[PDB]
Design an enzyme around this catalytic site. Structure first.
Site, PDB file in Angstrom:
ATOM      1  N   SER A   1       0.862  -1.214   0.000  1.00  0.00           N
ATOM      2  CA  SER A   1       0.000   0.000   0.000  1.00  0.00           C
ATOM      3  C   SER A   1       0.892   1.255   0.000  1.00  0.00           C
ATOM      4  O   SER A   1       1.673   1.390  -0.912  1.00  0.00           O
ATOM      5  CB  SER A   1      -0.977  -0.064   1.188  1.00  0.00           C
TER       6      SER A   1
ATOM      7  N   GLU B   1      -9.964  -4.742  -2.502  1.00  0.00           N
ATOM      8  CA  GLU B   1      -9.182  -3.619  -2.045  1.00  0.00           C
ATOM      9  C   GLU B   1     -10.016  -2.484  -1.437  1.00  0.00           C
ATOM     10  O   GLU B   1      -9.535  -1.811  -0.521  1.00  0.00           O
ATOM     11  CB  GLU B   1      -8.292  -3.072  -3.183  1.00  0.00           C
TER      12      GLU B   1
ATOM     13  N   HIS C   1      -7.607  -5.260   1.868  1.00  0.00           N
ATOM     14  CA  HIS C   1      -6.385  -4.510   1.672  1.00  0.00           C
ATOM     15  C   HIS C   1      -5.519  -4.815   2.889  1.00  0.00           C
ATOM     16  O   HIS C   1      -5.960  -4.666   4.016  1.00  0.00           O
ATOM     17  CB  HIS C   1      -6.727  -3.028   1.647  1.00  0.00           C
TER      18      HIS C   1
HETATM   19  C1  LIG Z   1      -4.299   3.538   1.747  1.00  0.00           C
HETATM   20  O1  LIG Z   1      -3.776   2.551   2.625  1.00  0.00           O
HETATM   21  C2  LIG Z   1      -4.172   2.657   3.988  1.00  0.00           C
HETATM   22  C3  LIG Z   1      -4.819   3.779   4.572  1.00  0.00           C
HETATM   23  C4  LIG Z   1      -5.270   3.717   5.888  1.00  0.00           C
HETATM   24  C5  LIG Z   1      -5.093   2.541   6.704  1.00  0.00           C
HETATM   25  C6  LIG Z   1      -4.437   1.461   6.137  1.00  0.00           C
HETATM   26  C7  LIG Z   1      -3.993   1.512   4.811  1.00  0.00           C
HETATM   27  O2  LIG Z   1      -3.371   0.332   4.406  1.00  0.00           O
HETATM   28  C8  LIG Z   1      -3.893  -0.554   5.391  1.00  0.00           C
HETATM   29  C9  LIG Z   1      -3.036  -1.847   5.552  1.00  0.00           C
HETATM   30  C10 LIG Z   1      -1.512  -1.369   5.946  1.00  0.00           C
HETATM   31  O3  LIG Z   1      -0.849  -0.625   4.866  1.00  0.00           O
HETATM   32  C11 LIG Z   1      -1.511  -0.327   7.081  1.00  0.00           C
HETATM   33  C12 LIG Z   1      -2.610   0.383   7.386  1.00  0.00           C
HETATM   34  C13 LIG Z   1      -4.036   0.169   6.720  1.00  0.00           C
HETATM   35  C14 LIG Z   1      -4.991  -0.505   7.794  1.00  0.00           C
HETATM   36  C15 LIG Z   1      -5.098   0.337   9.084  1.00  0.00           C
HETATM   37  N1  LIG Z   1      -5.670   1.708   9.035  1.00  0.00           N
HETATM   38  C16 LIG Z   1      -6.421   2.152  10.195  1.00  0.00           C
HETATM   39  C17 LIG Z   1      -5.639   2.580   8.068  1.00  0.00           C
END
Ligand SMILES: COc1ccc2c3c1O[C@H]1C[C@@H](O)C=C[C@@]31CCN(C)C2
Ligand SMILES: COc1ccc2c3c1O[C@H]1C[C@@H](O)C=C[C@@]31CCN(C)C2
Ligand SMILES: *[C@@H]1O[C@H](CO)[C@@H](O)[C@H](O)[C@H]1NC(C)=O
Ligand SMILES: *[C@@H]1O[C@H](CO)[C@@H](O)[C@H](O)[C@H]1NC(C)=O
Ligand SMILES: *[C@@H]1O[C@H](CO)[C@@H](O)[C@H](O)[C@H]1NC(C)=O
Ligand SMILES: *[C@@H]1O[C@H](CO)[C@@H](O)[C@H](O)[C@H]1NC(C)=O
Ligand SMILES: [Mg+2]
Ligand SMILES: [Mg+2]
Lengths: 528, 528
Positions: free
Chosen positions: B197, B324, B437
């Site tokens: 991500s 996703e 995701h």
């Molecule tokens: C755009 O990617 C993200 C935007 C926000 C968040 C996450 C994201 O990727 C998710 C999986 C990992 O990358 C870390 C945090 C995430 C899961 C936990 N939270 C709370 C928020």
């Protein structure tokens, strides 16, 4: 004598005709207007002056002057639409098939032929009304009307070539049926007008025009609707095409009077020779002289009339065929040929979409291409060919008809929708064309009941149920004889397939694509 | 001693850690930059001054200051991403897991955590590198970097808060690995950076940035790519958000110097308390402080760099998960809840699309809605819910990644694409969320190999093949051990599914939808 009928316009003498080992009466070539020749060319029609003596109505009348199809000289699939009588500007006649013995007051059906508003004849073998009249015991009428420049050249503001005169020809024949059909045994209060393609558009135009509504009871529209994109033009575009026609014949263009006088001295064929040069775009499914939104025959835009319920409220029965676009792609798009399977390259696909939506900007052409392309397999020749057939059919016939039925149903008194998808066993057109625009007509007129025509026994049976559905609807406003064809409703949107298999009911005919053509694309082109 | 390592910055002392009934060495909390505190807040990082004596690297470091998720207090699915150490602006450290006995020159993998550029920690249980290091015999590194305003507040033109400093933190850790990993047994010429991500976007940003390219050999991107719509902003938008942040804290806004000084006196939590108030639109999948297209770290627009081949050419391995969008819809779209099946009404669908494509005009929102609606069944709650998951996922993760892979592949030296679609048997999130995701990470880090975690034997086996694919690719530039994962090519576009079933190869991952997101919609919004 059963072949003698006295009408308000005079006595008429018909002829007896054999039909499926029996016989009925036919009154062919009855005049309903004065010949629109000379200074009457382009003018509104005048009613036929009554005559003394007996009018000989034993033979078919001349066909109106029109562009003759030479794309496939002698090929039957093509020749079946060409005029089969001598052409003449003296062509405003109607035909009546009457059951024997003569009915007293039976169901009346009046057929309005199609032909893209530029061609058509009431005398074609596929429109022979003897089978339907005979089989369903109805008085069957086929009218005629001027087509091409002779019927639709429009110089709005002028009283000499006002436009829509071909529609006024149809109306005059409908007035004549209203006033005289009782003498032939028909009930003028139960007149159903029915027609296909430009004839189906015409039927919907009489449902809309205040001046036509009172002349008939209910309506049947086959593969056409009034709002089709090719069925009408603004008075400005009509004017522009009339001036371009004059420009092609070296006419004095200083005034409407000068242009019209020049156009009236030209022989019919001279106008037809340049008719196709006035289209504004390189396109398919577009015709030169068609109805005009004039503020008279059509009081306001078709869409506001539909939106406000400004139309005849009654029952309608209507539908489309599976492959509405194939005929036009064969005739005018690159890559299609009559004797090949017509697999279409990606490139020909794109030039086909440009030809199919002539009025669209590049973003618009991209939206159509995206909507109809299978991107996991974009070079698939069969898919591109079929995709173009759907683009043409959906944009020109199907989605405009679905838009009309949904607007109509909100105010109407009963709607019956069908989807005709039977490919005739004896079709002479290639397989890739499928269920072609116009090919349900032969089933509606009962040709499958005559053995020499070579249909299967199941095709004869399909024809008989279609004829009975159409005549029962004409008689009662419901195709069902008291397995049911359900009513189409705003909520449910049901329709039936029409073929040799047991009836199936479905819902929301091509909704996915029609939301694109009726709501999305117009919004897109408007914003860009 | 195996736990003692002398680096160019000083001696470091690690600790032995048990792993699957064996043991390896771990060097946790190694500093790679000077603490970016006080007047150094918002500044580019400074390298850690060498130290005499032995650095105690037996315990995890603090996590950077960040917004803590309280949407589901105590719920494990949520808490697993929250900082598990005390937060501090003194947080620039890295961690190394080293096989025992110590390798001489083995494959190195450096993990870059995600968290929308506003959160994330290198110390989370799901990022424990001991299993991968142990199982595949690689030296595993996890770095850290400043997030939120501390890492990405951008006042372009200023040298005090230039933007992108969090990316410079990552680069500094990569420089440290390049310069010192040999002492831990790692081959600095075979360093693979991998991340998920925002961490996968970061990996792609180092592939693009001239100043980072030389520090690593190849790359792995999991559910992220540099060009994601949420991963960067223009210098004007970054500036606007920095000024809005100051405006929320009643800062003197007369100059950059005044704004920055004010922001530097605020305690960390004060900036975090108002961080989310600076977004320009009501939206989901958008984060406040992110990388800026600055003309320095990124020399030109990402699209022109991709188009012109202006990036590191090597092998890449990358992919996405099936659902996703579900995580973001749960957290911010109407109609979704954690404890219901989240069937979405037509209305909530439309407000979900408006939230998902914040930058779109009304024609744009219509195009998305048309593309994702099944018009024969538009009130279907499951379909609307799944349609929104695809809209969010396709627009934010999948299509940007497909655009990156297609641009990259034209100039690269080998691409391997995957689609992870296994729903973990022990997932604590509701069923409607699917393959979420972030939920392939646990398989990549081998959590399924530990019994107490309760995975099925087949999940353990999937984890082992993913770990071996990732490490073999890191080692050789090809995940295959000399059943094959085919190379993704411009012509063929092959990819494999990653799950417990026998491998299947497919082509053109979500092409249909990505042609809409990558080619059509941007053209539409540009013309309107
Ligand atoms: C755009 O990617 C993200 C935007 C926000 C968040 C996450 C994201 O990727 C998710 C999986 C990992 O990358 C870390 C945090 C995430 C899961 C936990 N939270 C709370 C928020
Ligand atoms: C838009 O409808 C049409 C436009 C052109 C033509 C036809 C159309 O409808 C077809 C079936 C029937 O209505 C009459 C003519 C058609 C078949 C014969 N030719 C040559 C041309
Ligand atoms: C009617 O016309 C046809 C052919 O023109 C002719 O054969 C027939 O006898 C005519 N009838 C009369 C009496 O005019
Ligand atoms: C048609 O009109 C009659 C009354 O005028 C009404 O009773 C009937 O329900 C209507 N049919 C439909 C389908 O609207
Ligand atoms: C390293 O730190 C941990 C905890 O802070 C401590 O238990 C360990 O003994 C330390 N080692 C030395 C010698 O500093
Ligand atoms: C990678 O580069 C080497 C030469 O530099 C070449 O031989 C090989 O074919 C390339 N691989 C791919 C898939 O491009
Ligand atoms: Mg078809
Ligand atoms: Mg999904």
């Amino acid at each position: 004598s059963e072949l003698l009928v006295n009408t308000k316009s005079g006595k008429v003498m018909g002829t007896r005709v054999p039909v499926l080992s029996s016989h009925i009466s036919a009154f062919l070539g009855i005049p309903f207007a004065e010949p629109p020749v000379g200074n009457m060319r382009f003018r509104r029609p005048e009613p036929k002056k009554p005559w003394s003596g007996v009018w000989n109505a034993s033979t078919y009348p001349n066909n109106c002057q029109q562009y003759v199809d030479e794309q496939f000289p002698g090929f039957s699939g093509s020749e079946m639409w060409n005029p089969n009588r001598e052409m003449s500007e003296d062509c405003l006649y109607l035909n009546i098939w009457v059951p024997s013995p003569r009915p007293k007051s039976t169901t009346v059906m009046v057929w309005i032929y199609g032909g893209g508003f530029y061609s058509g004849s009431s005398t074609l073998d596929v429109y022979n009304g003897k089978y339907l009249a005979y089989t369903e015991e109805v008085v069957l009428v086929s009218l005629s009307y001027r087509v091409g420049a002779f019927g639709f050249l429009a110089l709005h503001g002028s009283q000499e070539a006002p436009g829509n005169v071909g529609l006024l020809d149809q109306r005059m024949a409908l007035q004549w049926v209203h006033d005289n059909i009782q003498f032939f045994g028909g009930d003028p209060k139960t007149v159903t007008i029915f027609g296909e393609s430009a004839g189906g558009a015409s039927v919907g135009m009489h449902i809309l025009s205040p001046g036509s509504r009172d002349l008939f009871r209910r309506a049947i529209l086959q593969s056409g609707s009034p709002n089709c994109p090719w069925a009408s033009v603004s008075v400005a575009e009509g004017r522009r095409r009339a001036v371009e026609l004059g420009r092609n014949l070296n006419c004095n263009l200083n005034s409407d009077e000068e242009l019209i006088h020049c156009l009236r001295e030209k022989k019919p064929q001279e106008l037809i020779d340049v008719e196709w040069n006035v289209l504004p775009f390189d396109s398919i499914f577009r015709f030169s002289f068609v109805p005009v939104i004039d503020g008279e025959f059509f009081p306001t835009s078709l869409e506001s009339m539909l939106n406000s319920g400004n139309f005849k409220k009654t029952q309608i029965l209507l539908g489309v065929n599976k492959d509405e676009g194939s005929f036009f792609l064969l005739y005018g798009a690159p890559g299609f040929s009559k004797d090949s399977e017509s697999k279409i390259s990606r490139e020909d696909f794109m030039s086909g979409v440009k030809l199919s939506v002539p009025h669209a900007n590049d973003l618009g052409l991209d939206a159509v291409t995206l909507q109809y392309t299978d991107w996991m397999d974009d070079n698939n020749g069969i898919k591109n060919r079929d995709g173009l057939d759907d683009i043409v059919g959906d944009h020109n016939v199907i989605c405009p008809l679905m838009h009309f039925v949904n607007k109509y149903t909100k105010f109407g008194n009963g709607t019956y929708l069908y989807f005709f998808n039977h490919r005739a066993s004896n079709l002479v057109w290639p397989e890739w064309m499928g269920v072609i625009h116009g090919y349900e007509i032969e089933f509606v007129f009962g040709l499958p009941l005559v053995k020499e025509l070579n249909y299967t026994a199941e095709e004869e049976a399909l024809s008989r149920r279609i004829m009975h559905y159409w005549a029962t609807f004409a008689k009662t406003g419901n195709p069902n004889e008291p397995s049911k064809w359900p009513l189409f409703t705003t909520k449910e949107q049901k329709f039936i397939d029409l073929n040799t298999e047991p009836m199936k009911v479905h819902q929301r005919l091509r909704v996915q694509m029609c939301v694109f053509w009726n709501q999305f694309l117009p919004k897109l082109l408007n914003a860009t």
